[PDB]
Design a protein around this ligand. Structure first.
Ligand SMILES: *[C@@H]1O[C@H](CO)[C@@H](O[C@@H]2O[C@H](CO)[C@@H](O)[C@H](O)[C@H]2NC(C)=O)[C@H](O)[C@H]1NC(C)=O
Ligand SMILES: *[C@@H]1O[C@H](CO)[C@@H](O[C@@H]2O[C@H](CO)[C@@H](O)[C@H](O)[C@H]2NC(C)=O)[C@H](O)[C@H]1NC(C)=O
Ligand SMILES: *[C@@H]1O[C@H](CO)[C@@H](O[C@@H]2O[C@H](CO)[C@@H](O)[C@H](O)[C@H]2NC(C)=O)[C@H](O)[C@H]1NC(C)=O
Ligand SMILES: *[C@@H]1O[C@H](CO)[C@@H](O)[C@H](O)[C@H]1NC(C)=O
Lengths: 970, 970
């Protein structure tokens, strides 16, 4: 069974006077089981719906035959009643559409001045709803024309004419037109005669007589038309504006009837109409305040509740002005009662009972409407039933421990729990406690307390019992707790956790660190197990680091019971990271660094070491401070020893006795702000290069040697003994040379050079001061008295005089150019001497060839001109014939080889000696022997069977073509 | 309907051979609806329970008529079947009690040596259960005697004599005695002849032949009897002990059958029997392992579950050895399947179906028993019903926001949710999201989504729908967020929170600080509200202190939505308390303090001040520290300027720009370690006191000035010009005097004194060095030539000579003792002089009285002896008579009074002058005038009409009694 919820509710109807329908159907039907009897209210009094009267109840719907205004106007309200409860439908305000005949008094004629406006009232009769107005210039259907001169009001119905003349006279009357659901009716008014006085020929101010009202209250969605009609001479314009904002541009008109099609909450504000002509102005202000019909936000639903519970029914509604939410119970109003609290808002039941069952209604209300929301409260009384939440049937307990056994059945209301051990009914005492929600508490469990525990349940509906079996075991306790420990990094540490338990059961050890479980199977695994038995749970931390410090909880558990002990391990006293490296006090080579502190678990910080780099070019090398060991309580120390014009990043390392710690993040890229150079140019050399010019050369210097901005070289050069110093000022790094030449500077001139650097703010220090000379030129003095003589077939000797010193500088050597007989100078071979010698030897020549020799002189700059020539002829070639009649005699340790001397031909040279290569069986390499005559002796030992003898000639002709003689000993 | 759960279960029966009952009755009945069919199993296969056979099913209970060993001995098991499921009862091991007849083989006679022990076997037959053995020395009922020589075994039953002789011979026989449930049977064995050899007359070792076994496996509650019987000459003692502990003393016997009535788990261990006599010893070892039947811990219950859900039934048991928990479904074994997972432990269903409904049994098993636990799984297929968790019937939304509409009915299985906007069905797109669990997600909601949303639900069971109204409202947003702020203590601060919302609803502001709600109504309230409108919700913190800083969260809420912004306020950068102040480096006046850091939020710590007290005597004053302001990075400064011996507690104060901070907890009660005094005793004085003795008096000198331990005073005293110094050494502070007197020291002797202090380790500094004298004594020289003369009636003058200097010291004055004529020295009046005068005046005397005058001399010590006496007589009294014949004459400004002179009597003195007092009308006080004759002139002005004149006499006799004259002018 359920209470009545509506499917259709009664609507407000507009019944016309000229209706073709004799009945009014106010529809109401609510679904129900059993189907409801339906009562109707009229103005708070109940309608006696007798059969055969004019107010019949046809199917629930109220049918009213032939209504008139003094009998059936009012408010109507459907009440659906079953014996669950009574609900109230929303109110149907039955309004009568009627149009009365016009006012039959003899109205006065209207007198006004010509040239002004005129004011004729309509005086409309009593009506519903709001009429539409036009007037009549004559009989029907001759209306007033619609223009900018005649203005018809839809609020008061009067026609407003701005300026009148004598063509506007006519048969003036009012007219009304109403459009309704079943009929259309219009009715003519009384005759109005208008008379005009003499003409006031002036130009004057506008006078707005049609006033749009001061607080126009609109609902959301109502069409609102404001009116601002003006008198005056001449014709005024009408402007509409918004004072506190701007008009929305979907309906902006320059018309005296401003029409909004749908008024919403953004159109609320202060409005202004302005009339203005050529001679005056008039301003009229007003307001539109937008209100709302109530709509629901949070309503109530059909809740199933137990007897005795706390039920809070919140119910809220939104609308403008904000709705007084009130409550109905079963068609009657519900105030605050003995168990019922209404805060005009939530409905809070203190203790529920079975007389609170019924249809309750949330009603919201303001002056624009009244809305309703129904719910059923079904208060239920139940038997206790243990099929959803019973007592635990087969129960563990420990010896010396605690047991929480609840007995909470699905009972409405809260059942009387009387515990029993078998047949013995348990009473509260010093050991056994029956808490009156149902929970039995037994302290100090032994083996006399095991048994068959039955929880009884009782309310007025019925009874049930649920029976649990208590078994007493041994208690799991830790016999050897893990103690606190203090280690280092890299140490191994076990934590002892033995346990003792009942030997029927099983015992697992779970170790938790800071209430997170231990992952034994991590890659790079640290935690491992030692000494496996059943009841030994020793975790051994292997290669302990900083994340293994914290609280340890060895939980020995069975499936029924758990016991835990506490251990606290602290691993390293960490030389940790400092944070926020702040660079202060920026100087030339002096810079201030400040940092944060580290950590002090085992030990406080012993020292701070300081590091720097030039990023990204340079790396981390240790820089110097004063004091040279930074003391460990100092968060700031100042650092020296810097080389400027590089960017820098600074980090700091904390240290302890447990190892030098990992460093911090470096600081910001701080800029050096120098004012001085201090590094001299190195690698200074001078002299040489171009002839006649002073060229000084030196090394390039990179970024660590230059110091600062505006870098270049100051090379200072002057003549030895001169009183004038010349200074070169060239910027850049690539200019590693300077050339000075002048018309008064000759070759071999001594100069004094030194070099320093410069920057934007100073001059550099001095280099090595040395005396250099200007470079020499190529010579012009030829060699004299060149005489040549051949000494062999491939060598000749060329001699020349030691010549005088040239004007172009320093002579260093001589150059020999030579070519054959009949050849030229362009195919010559050029052989230079190693020094200033008066003679040299031309070697590598052909035999019997005449040569032409020219001697030139050279130095470092170039080669001078040629000498007068000399001629020489090489010696004859050696003879290609072998020596004849070769004989040999052996001995016990020697071999003597004799031969005839060589007689040459006419084109061959003489032989003054012989050379011989000798190879035997015991050696793989030949040996050289020399002689001056035609016989020789060589040692041959007794193991040699045969030998290889090659005989060639030597002398002034050169080495000849050798023979090859094979000598067998036996 | 429900499956079968058992009420009675089949017990294992022991059916004897001599039973009076022709049947066995293994009972099995389970409660059911529809009622269960009971099948039976025997040796792993089913019993064909035909009617009319020997295996009848009477009511579910199996009745077997006339059982024998080869036909019906086995394992019986009841199966209760309904079409919910099938359960299996636990096994009834039907074992038979039987006693077979004895061995009919011709057994051999037992032969051993006399003087030894002998073992006669029983050879017991096949039997069940465990027999009780007694024996036969003769025919029945002549048994063996029970003593400490015949030993009765229960495991093997053989005969054990410790020492035999020839009186133990006879026709030996075994016997057995079994006690059963329905019968008692005892049968007789074969005859045994005992023959013995010649006697081995020796004393030898014990020999335990009857050995208690190597692992005796006991259950919990079984009675265990071990056996240790020994041979030997003489008869040995039998001791039982536990090897790994001690025996429990409730059953300790010095008997060869160790008897435990109930073996529990504390008897598990190794056991030891020791046989020992006068000539040898024997030891044997064994063990008792206590095992257990399985009992349950966590079982399974009757669970209704939805189709398609995940279900985990855990099931665990306790017992030794630990039970292989396996599963039965419907009387058949249940392995791991496609949806059913068995881990031999918990049972996991992946996806349920309707074919998984049935009775499931959980079976625990070892070698000591098998236990069962039944449960029902009822897989429910349900229609979707929205009567318990519907769709929200009236849904509010924000424009531009977000809504989640869940559709989760009570449906088995998970229903198909297909949302609709009325009749238009909803497809997933980029704006509307229909999730497969049922939640409809609409982002960026405008007023085209306002509608009548219907959730649909579909499975194979049925169709249901629930319908919700979506209304589209404007979003609550914050137009002016609260910004972060930086203040001081004592500054006022307003956090702006303007909101914007639709005008139908109401807008409340909840301000939460660090997710705790702000209490405006605290005593000493700081948070107040400013500038009240509807949508303006700014909070103003007034007198803001240090707990008002943190995360502020302004939450504008309606009842349908919320909007929150964050503001962070920092209030003061505190000079907080430093914690754990540590005193190091304990010296004399130098002491080292180290403390912790504070806070640096606004500003860091500018300075540290150090204060101290001496508790409970001294208070908090600022002590001096080098350096004179402690810098803000310094946690350690050295503090000086202390006064020693005293206990101290040192407190530290941090300070900054924002005020002098709250001071810390002070340190420990630290004690300095001084060894030097530096304060001389002040206020030094000498002289006076006792006569003839040198007494030095000075100020007692308190414990803030005394410095070190072992305190006392060194007073150094010597004679002026003496070469010997005397030094006093008195400890204690109350001795403020020292007396030196000697036989060679006379009065008026000069002395030189100075004082210093001492302690345990040194001497104090010098005081003021002054020359004092020894104190004088009382004199002995009398005054000489005392002469007296009266000068008036009340005065006389006593003169004496200036006497010489006494031997007792210094004279300072004189003392006059005087009494009347006839009186004595004991009632005399004593008048002392103020110095060394030669004359003094005794005044205050009576007229006409003779006096006796004695003059003594005095000083500071005492008064010396008397002089020779002198006598003097005072003169006559003044006359008491008034002056007669008083006449007066007035003038313009004066009054002259004349009188006769006074003629005295013979006992009265003469009158040489007059004194008078005058009082008039204009003055309230009298005025005194003097005259030397018998007339006087007084000034009387003209306004005085009455005068008061009193006239008395004066002279050498004294002032007389006045008269009283009243003078009237007119
Ligand atoms: C029920 O209530 C309505 C409203 O109070 C009554 O209607 C009014 O009747 C008088 C006289 O006929 C009119 O002047 C009012 O203008 C009516 N007001 C409205 C809002 O219609 C009605 O008469 C009451 N019914 C009865 C039977 O008295
Ligand atoms: C056993 O102990 C409980 C707890 O001490 C008792 O419960 C209290 O009963 C009174 C009266 O109903 C309540 O006002 C208390 O609040 C209860 N205490 C708690 C903690 O719930 C209980 O009454 C005792 N049983 C008997 C039979 O006396
Ligand atoms: C509407 O959106 C949801 C969420 O994106 C879609 O649900 C997913 O469907 C597939 C196929 O069943 C699942 O594998 C995913 O896990 C689902 N996502 C989530 C978050 O649960 C849904 O299919 C979409 N609707 C339609 C009609 O396409
Ligand atoms: C214990 O620690 C040391 C140092 O870390 C290590 O060398 C050693 O191998 C560790 N012991 C074991 C058993 O791993």
């Amino acid at each position: 069974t359920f209470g009545p919820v509506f499917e259709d509710q009664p609507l407000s109807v507009l019944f016309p006077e000229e209706s073709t329908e004799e009945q009014v159907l106010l529809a109401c039907r609510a679904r129900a089981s059993p189907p409801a009897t339906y009562r109707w209210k009229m103005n708070g009094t109940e309608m006696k719906l007798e059969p055969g009267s004019r107010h019949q109840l046809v199917g629930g719907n109220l049918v009213i035959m032939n209504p008139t205004k003094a009998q059936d106007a009012g408010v109507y309200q459907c009440l659906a009643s079953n014996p669950v409860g009574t609900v109230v439908s929303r109110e149907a305000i039955l309004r009568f559409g009627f149009l009365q005949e016009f006012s039959k008094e003899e109205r006065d004629p209207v007198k006004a001045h010509e040239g002004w406006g005129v004011m004729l009232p309509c005086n409309p009769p009593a009506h519903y709803p709001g009429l539409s107005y036009r007037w009549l210039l004559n009989e029907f259907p001759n209306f007033i024309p619609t223009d900018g001169r005649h203005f018809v009001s839809q609020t008061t119905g009067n026609l407003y004419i701005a300026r009148t003349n004598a063509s506007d006279l006519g048969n003036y009357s009012c007219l009304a037109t109403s459009h309704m659901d079943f009929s259309t009716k219009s009715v003519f008014s009384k005759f109005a005669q208008l008379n005009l006085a003499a003409e006031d020929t002036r130009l004057f101010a506008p006078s707005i007589k049609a006033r749009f009202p001061a607080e126009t209250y609109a609902l959301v969605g109502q069409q609102v038309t404001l009116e601002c009609f003006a008198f005056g001479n001449p014709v005024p314009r009408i402007k509409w504006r918004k004072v506190d904002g701007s008009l929305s541009p979907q309906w902006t008109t320059a018309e005296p009837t401003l029409q909004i099609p749908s008024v919403s909450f953004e159109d609320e504000g202060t409005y202004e109409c302005e009339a203005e002509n050529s001679k005056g102005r008039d301003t009229v202000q007003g307001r539109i305040i937008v209100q709302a019909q109530p709509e629901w936000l949070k309503v109530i639903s059909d809740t199933e509740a137990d007897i005795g519970s706390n039920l809070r029914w919140g119910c809220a509604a939104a609308g403008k002005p904000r709705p007084t939410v009130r409550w109905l119970r079963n068609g009657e109003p519900l105030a605050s009662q003995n168990r019922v609290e209404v805060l005009a808002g939530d409905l809070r039941f203190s203790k529920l009972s079975l007389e609170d069952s019924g249809m309750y209604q949330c009603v919201a209300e303001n002056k624009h409407g009244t809305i309703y929301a129904s719910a059923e409260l079904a208060v239920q009384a139940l038997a206790p039933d243990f099929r959803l939440n019973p007592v635990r049937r087969l129960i563990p307990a420990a010896r010396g421990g605690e047991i929480l056994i609840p007995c909470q059945p699905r009972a409405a209301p809260k059942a009387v729990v009387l515990w029993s051990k078998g047949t013995e009914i348990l009473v509260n005492s010093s050991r056994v406690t029956v808490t009156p929600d149902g929970t039995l508490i037994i302290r100090n469990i032994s083996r006399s307390d095991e048994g068959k525990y039955t929880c009884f349940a009782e309310n007025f509906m019925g009874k049930a019992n649920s029976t649990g079996i208590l078994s007493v075991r041994d208690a799991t306790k830790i016999t050897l707790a893990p103690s606190s420990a203090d280690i280092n990094l890299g140490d191994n540490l076990t934590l002892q956790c033995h346990a003792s338990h009942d030997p029927t059961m099983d015992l697992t050890f779970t170790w938790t660190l800071d209430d997170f479980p231990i992952d034994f199977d991590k890659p790079g695994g640290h935690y491992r197990r030692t000494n496996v038995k059943e009841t030994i749970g020793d975790l051994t931390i292997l290669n302990a680091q900083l994340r293994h410090g914290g609280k340890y909880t060895c939980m020995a558990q069975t499936v029924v019971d758990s016991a835990s002990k506490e251990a606290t391990v602290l691993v390293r006293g960490p030389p940790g990271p400092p944070g926020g490296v702040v660079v202060r006090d920026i100087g030339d080579t002096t810079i201030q660094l400040s940092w944060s502190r580290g950590f002090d678990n085992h030990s406080p910080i012993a020292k701070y070491t300081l590091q720097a780099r030039t990023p990204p070019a340079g790396k981390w090398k240790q820089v110097r401070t004063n004091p040279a060991n930074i003391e460990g309580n100092a968060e700031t120390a100042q650092v020296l020893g810097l080389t400027p014009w590089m960017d820098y990043e600074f980090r700091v390392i904390a240290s302890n006795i447990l190892g030098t710690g990992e460093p911090s993040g470096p600081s910001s890229k701080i800029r050096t702000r120098e004012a001085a150079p201090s590094v001299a140019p190195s690698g200074l050399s001078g002299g040489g290069g171009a002839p006649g010019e002073l060229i000084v050369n030196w090394t390039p210097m990179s970024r660590e040697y230059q110091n600062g901005d505006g870098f270049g070289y100051l090379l200072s050069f002057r003549r030895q003994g001169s009183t004038h110093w010349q200074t070169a000022r060239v910027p850049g790094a690539d200019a590693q040379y300077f050339v000075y030449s002048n018309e008064s500077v000759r070759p071999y001139t001594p100069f004094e050079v030194k070099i320093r650097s410069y920057n934007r703010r100073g001059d550099g220090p001095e280099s090595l001061t040395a005396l250099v000379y200007s470079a020499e030129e190529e010579p012009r003095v030829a060699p004299t008295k060149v005489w040549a003589k051949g000494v062999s077939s491939s060598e000749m000797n060329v001699t020349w005089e030691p010549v005088q010193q040239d004007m172009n500088g320093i002579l260093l050597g001589y150059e020999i150019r030579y070519w054959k007989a009949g050849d030229k100078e362009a195919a010559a071979d050029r052989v230079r001497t190693a020094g200033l010698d008066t003679s040299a030897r031309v070697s590598g020549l052909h035999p019997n060839t005449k040569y032409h020799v020219t001697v030139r002189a050279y130095n470092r700059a170039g080669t001078g001109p040629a000498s007068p020539s000399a001629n020489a002829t090489t010696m004859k070639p050696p003879p290609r014939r072998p020596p004849g009649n070769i004989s040999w005699t052996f001995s016990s340790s020697s071999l003597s080889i004799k031969w005839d001397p060589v007689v040459p031909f006419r084109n061959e040279s003489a032989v003054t000696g012989y050379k011989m290569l000798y190879q035997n069986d015991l050696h793989l390499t030949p040996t050289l022997h020399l002689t001056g005559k035609n016989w020789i002796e060589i040692p041959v030992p007794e193991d040699i069977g045969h030998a290889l003898v090659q005989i060639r000639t030597t002398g002034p002709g050169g080495d000849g073509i050798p023979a090859e003689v094979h000598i067998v000993r036996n």
